[PDB]
Each structure stands twice: as C-alpha cells, then as structure tokens.
Ligand binder design. Structure first.
Ligand SMILES: Cc1cc(-c2scnc2C)ccc1[C@H](C)NC(=O)[C@@H]1C[C@@H](O)CN1C(=O)[C@@H](NC(=O)C1(F)CC1)C(C)(C)C
Ligand SMILES: Cc1cc(-c2scnc2C)ccc1[C@H](C)NC(=O)[C@@H]1C[C@@H](O)CN1C(=O)[C@@H](NC(=O)C1(F)CC1)C(C)(C)C
Ligand SMILES: Cc1cc(-c2scnc2C)ccc1[C@H](C)NC(=O)[C@@H]1C[C@@H](O)CN1C(=O)[C@@H](NC(=O)C1(F)CC1)C(C)(C)C
Ligand SMILES: Cc1cc(-c2scnc2C)ccc1[C@H](C)NC(=O)[C@@H]1C[C@@H](O)CN1C(=O)[C@@H](NC(=O)C1(F)CC1)C(C)(C)C
Lengths: 142, 104, 88, 104, 87, 142, 87, 141, 104, 104, 88, 143
C-alpha cells in the first residue's frame, strides 16, 4: 500500500532536526518495508541524496515516538527547482498529555516492572503498547 | 513577545499571559476582572520585591525565555485588608510522594 | 477574558482561561458552570495540567520549533493517572 | 546596565556584578577566576531553569531593577565531579529568632 | 581583582571583593584572605555583604539613592554586627 | 555661627524631594535658630520663595534623620539666572549600617522599652541619642 | 521635535513637546526628559498640558483669545497643582 | 502720577470687546481717581467720545479681572487723522493657570467660605486678594 | 490653520499639533518619532472609525474649531502585537471627587 | 471586618481574631501555629456542621456583628488520631453557684 | 504573635494573645514561662475575663460607639473578686 | 478652679447620647457648683444653648457613673464657625472590669444588704463608694 516509487529521478533534501530528540529517518522501500537510516543528533542537519516519489517518515531513535516532518507524517521528495534542495523540517508534535506521560514513565520503568506500578490495569496495557512503525503503517493502510 | 505567568496569592493561582511590553498596572487590571479587587488594593511582587505600576514586565525580568508556556513565572499577589495590606503569602503546592522502587 | 476555576484535592484553586480549558473535551462537558472540583488530583499535579493547557494552545499549529513538555519523574505516575481519567 | 548577583552553590555565596549585555559564559569565566573551575564543568541556573552559555543575562531575566546592590539576584551553581553534574543544592541561610515583645 | 572569604557562624562562606570588605576597618585588621565570625549568623552577614555593594554604588551618587532594606526580625542582630564591624 | 543673612534679595527655589521620606525643611533664622517649615511628601516638588544667603537643611519629618540636599548637609539659594529657580535635590544619605539599624529599631520599639533590649549598655545610649537638629548644628560649628 | 514625558500619580503618561513645557520655569528646572508628579492626578495633569498648548498658541497674539475652560469638579486640584508649579 | 491730561481736545474711540467677558471701561480722572463707565456686553462695540491724553483701563465688570487693550494695560486716545476713530481692542490676557484657577474658585465659593476649603492657608489669602483697580495703580507707581 | 490633538493608547497620551491639510500617514510618522514604532504597525481612529493613511485630517472631521489648543481632539492609537493588531484601548483619566459643599 | 472567635476542643479554648473574608483553611493554619498540628488532621465545626476549607468565615455565618470581642463565636475543633478522626467534644465550663439572697 | 495559656481551677486551658494578657498587671508578675494556674478562678469566670481582654484592646481609644460589657448576675460576684485580684 | 467663665457669648451645642444609659448633663456654675440639667434617653439628641467658656460633664442619671464627652471628661462650648453648632458626643468609657462589676452588683443589691455579701471587707467599702461628682471634681481639681 504505502510504497516508494522507483522513479530513478534524483532529488537532494536537507534533513533538519528541529527537535530535542535524536531522529531516526525511516525510508519505506519498494516492498513497503521500513528501513532505518543513519540517525541525526538534536539540532543537526545533513544534506542527503534521495529520489522523487520516495516515502520517508521520522521517529525518535531511542523510543520510536512519532515525529512530524513539515507538519505532516510523510515526506515525499519533489523536484529540486533551480538546484535548491527540498527542505525537510523534523519537529516535535504537540503530544497529548497522556502520551507524554507514557513516554516519561517508559523511560523510567523497565518493561518487566510495568505491571508492578500502582495504576489501573488499562495503563499497564498502554505502557506495553510501545510505539512501533510497522503497526502504524497498517493503521493508515486500513 | 508573549510572557506566561502564574499570579499566586494564598491558595489562589491565576494562569495568564501578557506582553513583555505590558505594564504592572495592566496586569493588575486582569486580576481585577477575575478576583474583583481594584488595582488600588493590589500589590504585585517578583519574589519579595514590590513591583511599580508603571514598569513593564520585561523590565521586571519577565521575558519570553524565562516566562514560558510550559513553565511560567510566578508573580506574588497581596490584597488590602480594610486599611493595611496583608503580607505576601503563597501556599506551596502539595509535595509529591517518594519515587517507587521500580522508578528509582 | 473568560476564566474558569479548577480546584484540586488539597484545596488549591487554579484559574485558567476558558478557551485554554476547552482543550479538554472532558472539562468542557464538565462545565456545561464556572467551577469544577477534582477530589483526587493534588495541586502538584493539577498545576502541571494547567501548564499543559497553555503549552498546547501556544504551540499547536506551529512551524517554529516546539519545545518538549517537561515532566519531573516524581510526578510522572500521578499525572498519568490524571491524564487517563481526563483523556487529555 | 549593571546587575548585582549572588552565585550560590551549597554553602558558597559569591558577590559580584556584571552587565545586562554579558553572557552566561562570561559569568562562568568570572566563577572560573574565583572558584578555579573551568566553564565546561559549570552549569548556571535561574531558579530551576538551566542557563545557556550564549544567552545574555538580561535575556535570562536578570535586569538592573531586579538585580540590585541592596538585594541581588540569586544564580544557582552546579559542578561536574567527573562526567556527571550534581543536582542543584543551595543551602538555606540561618533562621532569625522570633521577636522580642518589646519590639512586636 | 582580589577576593576575600567571610565565614559565618553556621558555616556559610561568602566570597566578596577585597576592596568592598575593607570598608570595615575591623575586617581589615583581621586580614593583616579568610575570616571566621562567631556570633554572626549567615542571615546577618548576607545583608552586610550587600551593604557593602550598596555603599560603594550609591556613595557619592547623583542618581536617586534607595532605602537600604533591613527586615525587622534581623534588625537587632545586624545592629550588633554593625557595632562590632564599625561599618 | 551658622545663620542666614538678611539680604532682602529674593531667590526662588525648587524643593525637590527625591527620597522615600516625608521631608521637613528647616530654615536657620538670622539669630541661628532653626525654624521648621511645611513638610513635603515623597516624590513631591514645591516652588518657594527665599533669599540670597539664607541657610536651609532637611530632616525626616517623623524622626529628624539627616537628609542631604544637593549631596551636602546645607543648602544656600544663589542667583536665579534668567529668572530660572534654583534646584534643591533632597535625597537619602548613604547611612552607616549602624545608624540605619538604629533607625529600624527606633521605629519598632517605644523609648520606654529601650533599656529592656538585650544589648550592650553602649547601644542603649546609642538608641536614646536619636537625631536632633540643634545637636547636629553645634557639631558642624565645632 | 523633542518631547518630554509627564507622569501623573495614577500612572498616566503625557508626552508633550519640550518647547511647550519650557513655558513653566518649574518644569525647566525639573528637567535640568521625564518628570513624575506623585501629587497630581491625570484629570489635572491633562489640563495642565492643555494649558501649555494654549499659552504657546495665544501668547503675543492679536487674534481674539478664548477663555481657558476649567470644569468646577477639578478647579480645586488644579489650583493646588498650579500653586506648587507656579505656572 | 497716573492721571489724565485736561487737554480739551476731542478724540473719538471705538471700544471693541473682543472677549467673552462683560467689560468695564475705567477712566482715570485728572485727580488720578478711577471712574467707571457704562459696561459693554461681550462681543459688542461702541463709538465713544473722549479726549487726547486721557487714560483708560478695562476690567471684567463682575470680577475686576484685568483685561488688555491694544495688547497692553492702558489706553490713551490719540489724534483722529482724516476722521478715522481710534480703535481699542479689549482682549483676554493670557492669564497664568493660577490666576484662572483663582478666578474659577472665586466665582464658585462665597467670600466667607474660602476658609472652609481643603487647601493650604496661603491659598486662603490668595483667594481673598481678588483683583482691585486701585491695587494695580499703586503697583505701576 | 492648525488642529491640536491627543493621540491616546492605553495610559499613554501624546499632545501634538498638525494642519487640516496633513494626512493620517504623516501623523503616524510623528508617533513613530515619539514611540519608535513604524506606521505599518499603527492604527489611528477617530472614535471607533479607522483612519485611512491617505486621507487628510480635515476630511476625517478634525477641524481647527473642534480640535482646539485648550481642548484638543482625541485620536485613538492601536499597535500591532507581533502579527495581529491589538484592540483600541484608552484608559480613562481619574475621576474627580464630589464637589465640596462650600462650592455647591 | 474583624471577627472574634473561641476555638474549642475538649478543655482547650483558643481566643483569636480573623477576617470575615479569611477562609477556614487559614484558620486551620492559625490553630497549627498554636497547637502544632497540621490542617490535614484538623476539622472545624460551627455547632455540628463541618466547615469546608475554601469557604470564608462570613459565608459560614461568622460576621463582625455576631462574632464580637465581648461575646465571641465558638468554633469546634476535632483532631485526627492517625487514621480516624475523633468525635467533636467540647467540654462545658463550670457552673455558677446559686444567686445569694441579697441579689435576688 | 505569641500566645499564653491561662489555666483555671477546673482544668480549662485558655490560650490568648500575650499582649492581651499583659493588660493584667497581676498576670504580668506571674509570667516573669508561658503558662499560669489560677487555683481560685473557675472557668466561667476566666473565660469572661479573657473576653474582657479582647474588649479592652479593641475599643480603647476609639471614637466608634463603645458597647456595654455584659456581665450576667450569676457571675458578677466571682468576676468582681477575680477582677480585684487581677487588677484589670 | 474648675468653673465656667461668665463670658456672655452664646454657643449652640448638640448633646448627642451615643450610650445605652440615660445621661444627666451637669453644668459647672461660675462658682464651681454642679447644676443638673434635663436628662437624655439613650440614642437621643438635644440642641441647647450654652456659652463659650462654660463647663459641662455627663453622668448616668440613675447611678452617676462617669461618661465621656468627645473622649474626655469635660466639655467646653467653643466658637460656632459659620454658625454650625458644636458637637458633644456622649459615649461610654471603657470601664475597668472591677468598676463594671461593681456597677452590676450595685444595680442588683440594696445598699443595706452590701455588708451581707460574702466578700472581703475591701470589696464592701468599694461597693459603698458609689460614684459622686464632687468627689470627682476635687480629684480633677487636684490634677
Ligand atoms: C546512504 C544514505 C544515508 C543517508 C542519511 S539519512 C540520515 N543521515 C544520513 C547520512 C541519506 C541518503 C543515503 C543514500 C546516499 N541515499 C539512499 O539510500 C536513497 C534514499 C532513498 O530514496 C532510497 N535511496 C537509494 O539509493 C535506493 N536506490 C534507488 O532508488 C535507485 F538507484 C533506483 C534509483 C536504494 C536504497 C539503493 C534502493
Ligand atoms: C511660608 C513659606 C513656605 C514654604 C514651604 S517649604 C515646604 N513647602 C512650602 C509651601 C516656602 C516659603 C514660604 C515663605 C513664602 N517664604 C519664606 O519664609 C522665606 C524662606 C526663607 O528664605 C526666609 N523667608 C522669608 O520670607 C523671611 N523674609 C525675609 O528675609 C525678608 F523679607 C527680609 C528679606 C522671613 C521668614 C519673613 C523673615
Ligand atoms: C458719558 C460717556 C459714556 C461713554 C461709554 S463707555 C462705555 N459705554 C459708553 C456709552 C463714553 C463717553 C461718555 C462721555 C460722552 N464722554 C466722557 O465722559 C469723556 C471720557 C473721558 O475722556 C473724560 N470725558 C469727559 O467728557 C470729561 N470732560 C472733559 O474732558 C472736557 F470737557 C474738558 C474737555 C469729563 C468726564 C466731563 C470730566
Ligand atoms: C434650659 C436649658 C436646658 C438644656 C438641656 S440639657 C439636656 N436637655 C435640655 C433641653 C440646655 C440649655 C438650657 C438653657 C436654654 N441654657 C442654659 O441654661 C445655659 C447652659 C449653660 O451654659 C448655662 N446657661 C445659662 O443660660 C446661664 N446664663 C448665662 O450664663 C448668661 F446669660 C450670662 C450669659 C444661666 C444658667 C441662666 C445662669
């Protein structure tokens, strides 16, 4: 469903991390399979080569939390007009307070010790629902 | 520039924003609309220092990079009891419990 | 402007702008009143709830770099339980 | 203008002055001349907020009308023992006695 | 410049400019770069150390001089310290 | 010794109170006697009529604490050039720390309980010798 | 042109031209670019500035001069203000 | 000093009240004594008959507030060249703010209730020193 | 013939003069010289009606006989906070007390 | 408005004053300063009615004209024995003797 | 401010502001502690005495109309003797 | 000593009773002698004619208890400014607790039964020492 097109038409892009987190770039290959690419430290940028019609999304490298690129979920390289590269602005979403609390707790509690916290059973299942790219791709595919 | 502020008196806390160029008196006018007390009967404080009505918020050290939406600055409030102003009293919030073992 | 009052379990009274509070559909329903009492959310948690209202209203729909919402570890569990009940 | 400051770490209190145009890094350089610790091993705080090396003291909310000679502003100090910075700990000052009845 | 340390009765260590400290001839005598003051708590020496800054700043000044602030709860102990330090 | 001279030569003066104290203006007559004049609240100004060679000093109206006028103790109106009045800038002196503490204690303890304070006998005599204009006048004469 | 700021007791800020303000030697003395009047409220200081403009306009004028209008409710405070400023 | 010359030379004058106030023309007599003449309602004017060298001054009729004539304090009829009458323009002086404030209060407080006003006692002596013709004549002398 | 005006914003009041032939833009330039804010960031009002930069003051109803030196006409001023213009706010002057009895 | 109060528990009677605008919690803070027990362990009563922390003393029916210096109002106090709050017990005062005959 | 305790014959403990108690010269001597026992004054008298302390401090040197201090007949004789001993 | 001065200069006065007691006005003659005048019920007022320099005091009509007028013991009619009369505010003094207790006992016990009460002889002598004006007048004369 969600796939890169093998156009073979190159396109230069600036990957620009405007977030306090280390960013994992994820490219959706021709089979639709997510492939991780080199990470970008917070506040850094890199000039990369890709192609027109390719699909990319971006996550936190340590937790796989979803991130925004140009205020949307998916980024598709276009044609470089006048040699100017396409600029990809990776930023933090405005998370819900619930997701933000889950992130902080996941970073503080080992996965084995989730069911030992004094919370409702529902939040233990929420803590185990760690963000993962493959699952969300199927949600959009449906 | 927008500055984000907590106006605190006793167990009362007003969350509001204003401009870095706005003055102490206009901020008192905001307190008046909420707590129904005229600017005449209000004294605003940054820590223990009394703030002058004419000074701007930037001048009193309330800046967009220290008065943040996710971490606002605290401005104390003191009302006038009959003829004398009360002392500045801000009840602290509740203190949180100890970190659980699985979180330590 | 329009302001609403949120009272914590320990008696602290938090006055926020109504538009900021309408962020939580939970709070919006609980208001349609100018006052809401929370008998289980202490002031060290409810204060951060109001900060989230301000942070959300301010940085939603922004190209400018949004900063992280800061949560101290000591309050992470109690804010989580509060956020699950309010679903915000 | 000039701002007057107390740099606080544990039971150490430094009295000094600077400019609103001075940056946090230059303030760390004066601490280096006094406490003999390099700026890389220093972290400066306004209340709980970390101060960034490049920002000016005025920007971080230290202004001449709040950082006064007769009532300076407090800046927290935290050192690195090797690779880890300690938490901020500012030892409180002594507590005054209660007032004589002839004075109340 | 040169800096001197003034240590209070409860162990607080105050780092002040040397020129500011010699305002008090008492301190000057105790130096001729560290001094211990028994009898003087930190809540009193703090204000002393601030008085020095205030004096150096507003002494011989055309700009409007502000009140020097002394809280009532500490007025008596600062008085004796000022009596002993002759400042 | 310290007295005004009857010049019968008018001179207009601005009394400008740049202090947080209520100011008492005191004119020393031709016999040297201090005469109190109307008080001035803090931050206020007044245009008054005086004469060349007249002597004026300024005190706290409630406590007779010494105040400065144009950064000295005494003020003498001079020539109004082009009709412009002479400016008298009344400000706080930089009190010694001992005198300022005495001021706070005097304002808090009634004179009857001075000998009840836990102090050295020298400090009790210091609290009772509260500022007095005649005393300061003879001190300046000597 | 150069402007001066006149601040009343209730915080109102009145910006007038320096040339108009030099009408009062009192103000000129208070300048040697802002003056604060902690005794004159805004309903008084406003007509004071109105008086400044009226005087500069009608001094040395043959054209018919109109009355300076003063409402009774403020007549007493402006009188007290005018006595101290002698304008 | 200030008196009028008995020159016996007729001289016609236009007394024009360019003021909001009712005007009192005051002629100084040969003895130097002020003699008041018929009032002039605001905005009116009359061709009158006087003589060369005679001295006139003009005041508010109700209050004796001093008024300017031809930009100054005193008027003296001059020579009628070619039958033109001499014109006298009675205008409002630029009162100081204090005198105008004294005027408004005087017009509002009865002279006995000055001492009941919440004002410094010097102002009480000012409110009573209301304008006076013989007072101004001694001043010039 | 000259018109005499009060340009009022919040607790700020500017006393200035112009000619009936002057435009609203030129007046905004006077303000810029006083408050140091450019005309594109200013909005001027006669009562509640916005004044167009190109129109002359005579056209907008400011005449030499209603805008008098001893009783000037009021022109509202509104600034642009970042990207949005603020509302027109004019703080009233203080209110005089009740007339003393001896003056009634 | 000043209100004058007797806060009673068992054989303990505290005489104090407060404001009609002051809250029940601030009264608990006053009891805390005297008897050294925190508000969490305090319960205040008007007759048998439990008083809520946020309401003012005037709201709870303590007015400057019923809580008088020469005849104050009684506020009951009940402390918390670790996990259970005690019942309200105000011990009565002694009873006067019979009026002598010469006074009848 | 500071508070003192006055104990009656029956065990009742009355906590009053120290300045209020210092009105009575007799109590002044018994303090120079923070507590006093009165082995002859019952509670129904010492409470009315404590009200009188409040009444004296509040209305002394006041232009506002002074109200009557009320004394019930049944306690008049015991209050009289107490007032004689306390010199108030 | 304490006497009214025969000035013959009239002065109108408001006798205002802000007390719960019936007030007896007493004028001190030019000879120093107390003269009783008509009484005033609680909360009532009367416009009277006196003279500058005259001396007045006020007592309870039933018990001769001392009362205050303008927060002092004696009232002297002064000059009527602008014709406005002078205001005499008759109020309760803050009695000592002992004197107030004596008042209640005197009001409940006949004087004949004073020596029958179970008290110290000192309190009996105090109950018999009922307020008296001449006494008080000689006390103020000593002052
Ligand atoms: C190695 C590398 C790292 C980074 C990053 S990311 C964060 N830091 C760094 C340094 C950024 C680009 C690259 C290389 C130069 N660039 C690609 O890998 C592009 C991107 C995507 O568009 C896929 N891709 C192809 O090269 C693909 N080849 C083709 O599509 C064709 F040859 C038919 C046209 C495949 C993979 C061989 C299948
Ligand atoms: C009444 C008054 C209050 C204030 C003040 S102060 C703070 N707020 C206010 C309103 C300011 C000036 C005054 C009066 C108008 N001004 C004087 O009192 C001057 C000042 C000094 O210079 C003495 N003095 C003379 O007028 C002296 N007169 C003379 O020497 C002569 F006539 C022979 C030359 C004597 C005294 C009458 C002897
Ligand atoms: C009655 C009258 C009213 C008005 C006025 S004013 C405002 N509305 C109105 C209608 C204007 C002129 C007059 C009369 C016609 N005109 C004078 O009164 C002149 C003016 C002065 O100059 C003095 N005077 C003489 O007539 C004097 N006579 C002489 O000088 C001689 F006979 C020696 C030459 C004396 C007085 C009789 C002594
Ligand atoms: C009758 C009366 C009742 C009340 C009172 S009181 C409580 N309710 C009410 C209605 C208040 C004033 C009055 C009369 C009208 N007013 C006086 O009695 C004044 C008061 C004092 O000032 C003395 N007095 C003189 O009239 C004295 N006359 C003179 O001194 C002179 F003729 C030489 C000047 C003597 C006595 C006649 C000798």
């Amino acid at each position: 469903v969600l796939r890169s097109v093998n156009s073979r038409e190159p396109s230069q892009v600036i990957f620009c991390n405007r977030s306090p987190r280390v960013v994992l770039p994820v490219w959706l290959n021709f089979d639709g399979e997510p492939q991780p690419y080199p990470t970008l430290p917070p506040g850094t940028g890199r000039r990369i080569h890709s192609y027109r019609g390719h699909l990319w999304l971006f996550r936190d490298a340590g937790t796989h939390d979803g991130l925004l690129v140009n205020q949307t979920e998916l980024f598709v390289p276009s044609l470089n007009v006048d040699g100017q590269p396409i600029f990809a602005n990776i930023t933090l979403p405005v998370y819900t307070l619930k997701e933000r609390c889950l992130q902080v707790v996941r970073s503080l509690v080992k996965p084995e010790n989730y069911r030992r916290l004094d919370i409702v059973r529902s939040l233990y299942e929420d803590l185990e629902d760690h963000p993962n790219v493959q699952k969300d791709l199927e949600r959009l595919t449906q | 520039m927008d500055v984000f502020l907590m106006i605190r008196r006793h167990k009362t806390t007003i969350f509001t924003d204003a401009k870095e160029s706005s003055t102490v008196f206009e901020l008192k006018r905001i307190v008046e609309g909420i707590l129904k007390r005229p600017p005449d009967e209000q004294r605003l404080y940054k820590d223990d220092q009394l703030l002058d009505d004419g000074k701007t918020l930037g001048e009193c050290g309330f800046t967009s990079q220290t008065a943040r939406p996710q971490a606002p600055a605290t401005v104390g409030l003191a009302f006038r009891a009959d003829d004398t102003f009360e002392a500045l009293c801000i009840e602290p919030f509740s203190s949180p419990p100890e970190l659980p073992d699985v979180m330590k | 402007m329009m302001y609403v009052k949120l009272i914590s379990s320990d008696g602290h009274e938090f006055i926020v702008k109504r538009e900021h509070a309408l962020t939580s559909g939970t709070i919006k329903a609980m208001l349609s009143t100018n006052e809401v009492n929370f008998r289980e959310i202490p002031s060290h948690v409810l204060s951060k709830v109001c900060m989230y209202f301000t942070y959300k209203v301010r940085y939603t729909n922004s190209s400018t770099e949004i900063p992280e919402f800061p949560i101290a570890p000591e309050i992470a569990l109690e804010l989580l339980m509060a956020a699950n009940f309010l679903d915000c």
